[PDB]
Design a protein around this ligand. Sequence first.
Ligand SMILES: Cn1cnc(CCNC(=O)c2nn(C)c3ccccc23)c1
Ligand SMILES: [Zn+2]
Length: 140
Amino acid sequence: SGAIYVGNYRVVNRHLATHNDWANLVWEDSSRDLLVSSTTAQGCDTIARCDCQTGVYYCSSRRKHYPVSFSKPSLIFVEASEYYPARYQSHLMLAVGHSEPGDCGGILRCQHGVVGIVSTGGNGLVGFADVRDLLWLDEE
Ligand SMILES: Cn1cnc(CCNC(=O)c2nn(C)c3ccccc23)c1
Ligand SMILES: [Zn+2]
């Protein structure tokens, strides 16, 4: 679990969105595994606006933050689980690191701010949903 709180927005994995998120919806995209809802209070996270490929992510299944090198956002064919079908996920970055399904929502950050959130992984892979292109998160 986990979210980004920037301005009056809450950014979560689309597959973990609550009824309150859907009832206060700003934007959602299934191909990216992202959903954004509106908040009453202002958040403290800042979004990175950069092309960093090194940063640190939070892993809830280890209570630890790990430094990682990650790929540029791309369209990767994903994993067919017994929970979910196999499909193309867009704007996805991969790194070598531990993850479990419940780690989704953990933040990946660089020197500039928040880069994205945990969304895919396995066999020592963790994939993150990028948010650096969503410029509108910084206003309105
Ligand atoms: C519809 N839908 C779109 N996206 C999803 C979530 C897909 N994520 C996973 O299945 C998953 N996520 N992490 C970090 C893992 C680590 C090990 C094994 C599996 C996973 C569902
Ligand atoms: Zn950066």
